[PDB]
Design a protein around this ligand. Structure first.
Ligand code: NA
Ligand code: NA
Ligand code: NA
Ligand code: NA
Ligand code: NA
Ligand code: NA
Lengths: 191, 182
């Protein structure tokens, strides 16, 4: 749960891990989704669209694989706006200064997108964030007040859905973590 | 990682919450699955059978709704043996002892030569406790987990006691209109 938090209605947070991609791509432009990663993103988009929810926005990491995952998912959610942010780019694997910078940035993402209540909120909101494993691990453990040793104990599949429910007073519930039950087992990967 | 733990191979633990049931049943024999609860259990059994795994055993709570959830899931898993236990069943002295029983379940089934795949069909408070205990999360954390009826929660315990949570509360294989929390 979160301290010093007061929102006007309940917020549903859907954290999506980017789909399978070309890890060995030389440049960032080369680190595109694999054919299977594209199929994974289609399955996640189908599932999100079947929920019968009006999503307020899709916020996504600016990494190539997150942009491409977002593009595919967004096809299933016509009219939902998309916002790119460098704050949700992946953090270094769990050089000291790079880790300092990543920790500060992902904390800023948590504060800006998760802990921040929108004074303009007028009804329950449903928000999609398409990003990366370490970012999602950090956000989940911070929101639930789990220790940082918890990050590596969460093992998230490509394209998986993690669903947090934030009540107006800051109580946070974990409804699902790493959900890929909507994918056939022969399409499920971790990298 | 879990302390004082040394296994010979990796253990996959699938924790299944019982399906929707008649909460207002007067006696325990009356607290049976609803028609939708039976459909949920069928969906979970279909999913478990599709994973390409040979399950070593199904351990289940002796509560009526867990027995009936197990009966349906087991139809999809021929040859997998079933074990009933009171340890997994869901004033002040009775509540303390119920809590002590859940810690005993954790010690007996979780903390205790080839990789194994084990199914445990039980209840929300038991599963949430086990998840937070295995992941070494604070004791207050359990109530922050919200599990759907018939959901699959998947823990992996490595031989050195390292634990990973692969999924929690998965009902992605159910159509949205079949999903319930009570
Ligand atoms: Na990329
Ligand atoms: Na809220
Ligand atoms: Na996962
Ligand atoms: Na029952
Ligand atoms: Na759930
Ligand atoms: Na359900």
């Amino acid at each position: 749960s979160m301290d010093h938090y007061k929102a006007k209605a309940t917020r549903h947070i859907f954290l999506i891990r980017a789909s399978q991609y070309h890890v060995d791509g030389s440049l960032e432009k080369d680190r595109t989704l694999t054919p299977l990663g594209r199929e994974q993103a289609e399955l996640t988009g189908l599932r999100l669209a079947s929920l019968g929810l009006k999503f307020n926005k899709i916020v996504h990491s600016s990494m190539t694989r997150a942009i491409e995952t977002t593009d595919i998912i967004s096809r299933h959610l016509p009219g939902v706006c998309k916002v790119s942010t460098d704050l949700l780019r992946e953090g270094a694997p769990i050089e000291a200064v790079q880790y300092y910078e990543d920790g500060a940035r992902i904390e800023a993402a948590f504060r800006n997108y998760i802990h921040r209540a929108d004074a303009r909120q007028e009804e329950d909101s449903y928000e999609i964030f398409i990003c990366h494993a370490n970012v999602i691990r950090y956000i989940v453990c911070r929101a639930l007040q789990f220790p940082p040793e918890g990050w590596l104990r969460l093992s998230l599949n490509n394209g998986s859905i993690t669903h947090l429910v934030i009540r107006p007073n800051g109580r946070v519930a974990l409804r699902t973590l790493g959900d890929t039950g909507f994918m056939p087992p022969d399409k499920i990967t971790r990298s």
